[PDB]
Amino acid sequence: VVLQRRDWENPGVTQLNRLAAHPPFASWRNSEEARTDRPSQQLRSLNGEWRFAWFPAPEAVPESWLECDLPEADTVVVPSNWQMHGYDAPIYTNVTYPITVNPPFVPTENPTGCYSLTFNVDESWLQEGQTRIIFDGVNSAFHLWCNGRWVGYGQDSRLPSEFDLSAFLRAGENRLAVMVLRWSDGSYLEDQDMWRMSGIFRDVSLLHKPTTQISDFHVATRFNDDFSRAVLEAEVQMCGELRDYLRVTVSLWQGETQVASGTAPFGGEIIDERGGYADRVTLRLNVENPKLWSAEIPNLYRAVVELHTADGTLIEAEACDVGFREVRIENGLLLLNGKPLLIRGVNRHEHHPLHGQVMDEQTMVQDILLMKQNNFNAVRCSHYPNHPLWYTLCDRYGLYVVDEANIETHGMVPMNRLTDDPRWLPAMSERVTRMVQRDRNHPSVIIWSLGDESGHGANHDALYRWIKSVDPSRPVQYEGGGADTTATDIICPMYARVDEDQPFPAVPKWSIKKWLSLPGETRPLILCEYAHAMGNSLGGFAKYWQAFRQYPRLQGGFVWDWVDQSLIKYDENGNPWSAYGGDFGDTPNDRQFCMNGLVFADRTPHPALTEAKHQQQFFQFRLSGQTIEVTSEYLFRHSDNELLHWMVALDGKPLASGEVPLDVAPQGKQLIELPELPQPESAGQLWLTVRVVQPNATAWSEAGHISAWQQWRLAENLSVTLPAASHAIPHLTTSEMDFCIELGNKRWQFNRQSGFLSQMWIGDKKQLLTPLRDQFTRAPLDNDIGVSEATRIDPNAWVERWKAAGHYQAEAALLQCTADTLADAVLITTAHAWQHQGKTLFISRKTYRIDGSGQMAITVDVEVASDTPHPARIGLNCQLAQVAERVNWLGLGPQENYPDRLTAACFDRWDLPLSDMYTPYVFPSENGLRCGTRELNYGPHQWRGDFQFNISRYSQQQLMETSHRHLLHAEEGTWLNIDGFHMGIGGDDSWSPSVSAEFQLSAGRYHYQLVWCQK
Amino acid sequence: PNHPLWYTLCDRYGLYVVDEANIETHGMVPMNRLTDDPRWLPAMSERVTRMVQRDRNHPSVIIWSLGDESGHGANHDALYRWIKSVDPSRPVQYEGGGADTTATDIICPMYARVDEDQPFPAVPKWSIKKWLSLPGETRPLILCEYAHAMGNSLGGFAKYWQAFRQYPRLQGGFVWDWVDQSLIKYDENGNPWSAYGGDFGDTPNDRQFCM
Amino acid sequence: VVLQRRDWENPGVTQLNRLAAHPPFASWRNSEEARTDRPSQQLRSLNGEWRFAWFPAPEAVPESWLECDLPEADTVVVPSNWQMHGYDAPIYTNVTYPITVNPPFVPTENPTGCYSLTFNVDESWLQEGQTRIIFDGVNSAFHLWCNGRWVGYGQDSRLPSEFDLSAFLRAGEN
Ligand SMILES: CC(C)S[C@@H]1O[C@H](CO)[C@H](O)[C@H](O)[C@H]1O
Ligand SMILES: CC(C)S[C@@H]1O[C@H](CO)[C@H](O)[C@H](O)[C@H]1O
Ligand SMILES: [Mg+2]
Ligand SMILES: [Mg+2]
Ligand SMILES: [Mg+2]
Ligand code: NA
Ligand code: NA
Ligand code: NA
Ligand code: NA
Ligand code: NA
């Protein structure tokens, strides 16, 4: 009947013989074990070495497999995705379905994974009670056999599927056979923007329950107006024979102290004309002055639910962590424990570069520590229920969670084709209902989400109301169909900009500030997705946070996203490298769009992470005279693990410093008076830097952790002293092809045909490998490119506008190149025009003044045609002959920063190895810029002025021609790009131009000056 | 849902119709055991949605009903909202779980009395006059069933109509019911007679309660 | 598959291969006929004399019935309730379920009505278009075969169940 019914092509069949969903069970038979959350003898892991065989279609699986192991099969670790073992290719596609859109049908060629296990079952498990098997995650559908006999079927890749094996098992040795289909009717609701994989990728376990058992339990906490009193309400359901002697005790523990306890027989209150639930009981416990749960202080109690006889014989105990907190929306504000939240959120997919979509405790803990260390307090489970341990860790470490149903139909046309179709309501309903049934007792879950990018259909409205009816304790959100539909309590747009409207027909993305005040609108706004962190991105991040802080009903958002979905591949030499879409032969694919993270797949931070940390700081600062004002944005805690370090420096030279403990009440202010600082010995700018340091280690951070910082300019003393007049005069030598200038052991050469400095000598060693030339382009960022491809041009993308205008191929044409000998200097004057097919794009006019001190002063004046697309940069570049170890600069750093992403950077004296001056984005682009730089040092060279720079072994050309970082080769010498001006990087999204007007180079005329010397 | 011709005739002759989904779980303990169970939501959804899909163009249909005597469960709320979303042109009513739940636009009790309260726990049947003015209550009241016309009955019928006429928000009701459910049997002489519960050897049965 | 799956004891299966519900259709090929609500040549009644046999359970139904009329069957009027023809007793109960309350299961003794019809289909219906069968009311669940081949399954006694027969029908007798 199995191959004949084809249940994986029927949205009316999502399971067969599957047990009801429920909160995490362990069936403890000792109450103390339940309290302490120790392992349970009744819950066994079936994880480890299994048997696996791959087949092209279910029709190709031999019947012998049901009863006997296939000799050709391999021994593989489970949980796993079989693409990660190389059995077939993972596919990266974004919107377009990885299969033909023909609901409910999938392809006849349907990769089929045949898993099997031979394992022991102890006799005690079969004499009495119930033995069930739990598959936490199977992608995407499966049939189950036990000892050759058919058990059942399950769909939904992201929630547990449980089956009763009581009648199927024998004492001693048993064999499970699992046939896992890659594609099913379930796949139509699983079109998330991620790698498409398959297999048994979450834990497998056996659970023993007594016949008379706790089958469900719900925990609720309600409060008085000031949260000084709480009632814990626990509804408990049983299965088995009802008996007068049966009791439930719910006890609440704070550590080893029992705080409250309730005991009752079964039999609920009257519900309707037919009575009540005889198989249910509700316990109500009073808690005075409850310690409240939040992301700031994740206070937890332990609830123990004991099923027992009147006389005190335990039948079984279940348990959970309890966080006392109230989530509600009032007067248009999302409140936690009566206070308005500011969501410092991030979207997080379950991704490992080696193990695919299999999650482990270590990786989960790594992510949480990094999140909190970078001032995140919230996470969205994009876009499916997570591995059950995730919620446990969010409960205990303290993160707000949006729990999201595994429903995404992005690739449908229109997007709501299935979600507005009542035929798909049953499949949809199970993805929502079984999520709520599983996760409703986790305090970390504060908001339910109906899924992602599935338009808005009537099925959403029905399921929205279902959740509101079953769980009034949490708001329900959903972005589909324009982010403010009748199926959402929160306006939750994706990539809506701060000030700029994007008025798409039917689904406009209004300016978030404007959206709040639309006629009739009263809801809070929290972006489900914003600041698309794809490659060199997060430009304009500060603009969001300024708006979040100014507007009460702008309550933050979730960054897209946490971790690059790159996968490890190996080259001919067995060296690992990071791969994206298309690198596995997968086609169609969406290339590097799988990498949008604040961190690399191995959890190394992108530069953007520090900008997020700084903007999401919990302390705000103002300076007035000698007074620093510190304001706390904590809602609940006092600053009892914080001290303020202050430092004053003159152009990087430390002048004074000190510490002051912070004592700020939540949302309070502290004034700190700086001591009178002695005036500087010399000329320059004084800078004040403050840092908030955490003296003590926490559960989530080490001692000395810096949580916040800020900088101000103090007094500036402008240099008025003239440099000592030298007695030497540079000597000009002229040929037909060159102007040469000599001073001591120094020599400069200007090519009279090109009009550029072609060479410089110190002693008689060449300093340049490539002449010093103007540069108006950059190796395009992911944001510059957008969705543009060679086969499908998007003429609107910045890269295509520059290409079509001829920016990348425009050649310098010399207009003027003269030399004059002065009193104590040689003056070279040049003029160039960059042209494309008769059109002059840019004009550059320069003077180079070389004096008797050996300093070369370069003055640059650029004109940009008003009708050419604004250029990516206005600067100079050259390839230096020198390769030096260190890069030393006075400017913004230490990390990579761009004009619209530099708030996190501090002005100071920085010194890094050359390799740190390059950011290894997996898709190579312009990278490693540092802005606001007044002095740059590299080997013998020093440049002074007010510029942006990057410096590395890779030319802009190589960066733009190479599609993977592992294929980059260090070039001879060092490429230096020194810009007077550089365009913003953008990132509000990565599929339309997102660089704000104020960060585009539109001024028409530009001026900058540089001094080049040897030190 | 009725035979399709019924709606054609109500359209043409002129009767207001309440179209009711084929869902009644009266015998469950408690009455909402299935309708509050998410696993029965798919079966229930089809009985509601396929009714609306079939009958939504009939002018005679003025109100949708979610079924009858199935308590009040979360499945009712889900389906209430589905209809409200798909067809804003008709109010949705449903009596289960106390006749004034979040799954009904109309207070629609059965056998609520005019002046006399019947304060059953959980699901009281208030005096219809008193029900209207309960704190916070603003909805119209139309009994889905009243005046149980079993045998020699309809005593006090005039008391309903006096109240309907006096109170604007008391907008009437549906008598229970139109036609005796008796079946013809034949005796030894071949003579026809009217039969009720039990007369076909059917047991357990509810005797003359079908009339 | 039919007896093995027991679709009538699974609330997750309420139909198989059933077409989407819709308002009353007649597929007129003339606008004036549609306007006047006059009969449509494309909508045919199958009401009348059918073949019928009663069984105490679906397990008691012989395989031969799928492809050949059972000689012991009677000719009865359809639409009908088979209790009104005297094949078993009608049951009057108010609140208490007529069956043991044990969801999703029903009694193993489950009265089964086997209906059949031999009919002709107009030639032009086989060459082009779509031919569907509509059952306006079947109490309480049913499987459908056409010319020995299984078509689908349906529940809900009070709404139409419709099935595409286009791939099942033949020239002449069906
Ligand atoms: C490219 C847009 C049309 S869709 C856009 O794609 C992004 C790519 O990372 C993300 O998946 C977003 O969730 C989605 O809105
Ligand atoms: C007998 C009551 C407890 S239930 C009562 O039974 C009546 C009998 O005609 C009707 O069926 C009503 O709808 C029902 O409420
Ligand atoms: Mg299916
Ligand atoms: Mg998507
Ligand atoms: Mg069924
Ligand atoms: Na705000
Ligand atoms: Na992506
Ligand atoms: Na590149
Ligand atoms: Na009235
Ligand atoms: Na009756």
mmCIF file of N, CA and C in Angstrom, chain C residues 29 41-42 121-131:
data_model
loop_
_atom_site.group_PDB
_atom_site.id
_atom_site.type_symbol
_atom_site.label_atom_id
_atom_site.label_comp_id
_atom_site.label_asym_id
_atom_site.label_seq_id
_atom_site.Cartn_x
_atom_site.Cartn_y
_atom_site.Cartn_z
ATOM 1 N N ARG C 29 -23.545 25.858 -22.930
ATOM 2 C CA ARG C 29 -22.775 26.237 -24.121
ATOM 3 C C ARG C 29 -23.584 27.209 -24.957
ATOM 4 N N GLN C 41 -27.529 20.422 -21.601
ATOM 5 C CA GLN C 41 -27.133 19.127 -22.167
ATOM 6 C C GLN C 41 -25.871 18.567 -21.503
ATOM 7 N N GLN C 42 -25.100 19.444 -20.861
ATOM 8 C CA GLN C 42 -23.823 19.065 -20.249
ATOM 9 C C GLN C 42 -23.960 18.619 -18.795
ATOM 10 N N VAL C 121 -22.337 6.882 -22.162
ATOM 11 C CA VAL C 121 -21.843 8.250 -22.255
ATOM 12 C C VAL C 121 -21.771 8.698 -23.718
ATOM 13 N N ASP C 122 -22.394 9.839 -24.009
ATOM 14 C CA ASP C 122 -22.351 10.463 -25.334
ATOM 15 C C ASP C 122 -20.931 10.484 -25.903
ATOM 16 N N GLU C 123 -20.816 10.114 -27.176
ATOM 17 C CA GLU C 123 -19.525 9.991 -27.858
ATOM 18 C C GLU C 123 -18.632 11.226 -27.701
ATOM 19 N N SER C 124 -19.209 12.413 -27.887
ATOM 20 C CA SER C 124 -18.435 13.657 -27.885
ATOM 21 C C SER C 124 -17.765 13.978 -26.539
ATOM 22 N N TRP C 125 -18.277 13.399 -25.450
ATOM 23 C CA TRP C 125 -17.714 13.606 -24.107
ATOM 24 C C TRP C 125 -16.379 12.888 -23.901
ATOM 25 N N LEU C 126 -16.105 11.891 -24.736
ATOM 26 C CA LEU C 126 -14.901 11.073 -24.604
ATOM 27 C C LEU C 126 -13.719 11.653 -25.374
ATOM 28 N N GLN C 127 -14.022 12.434 -26.407
ATOM 29 C CA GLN C 127 -13.007 12.995 -27.296
ATOM 30 C C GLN C 127 -12.394 14.263 -26.713
ATOM 31 N N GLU C 128 -13.229 15.070 -26.056
ATOM 32 C CA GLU C 128 -12.833 16.393 -25.579
ATOM 33 C C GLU C 128 -13.459 16.711 -24.222
ATOM 34 N N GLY C 129 -12.842 17.639 -23.494
ATOM 35 C CA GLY C 129 -13.396 18.164 -22.243
ATOM 36 C C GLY C 129 -13.191 17.282 -21.023
ATOM 37 N N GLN C 130 -13.904 17.615 -19.951
ATOM 38 C CA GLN C 130 -13.802 16.909 -18.679
ATOM 39 C C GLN C 130 -15.179 16.453 -18.220
ATOM 40 N N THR C 131 -15.296 15.168 -17.898
ATOM 41 C CA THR C 131 -16.533 14.609 -17.358
ATOM 42 C C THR C 131 -16.321 14.270 -15.886
#
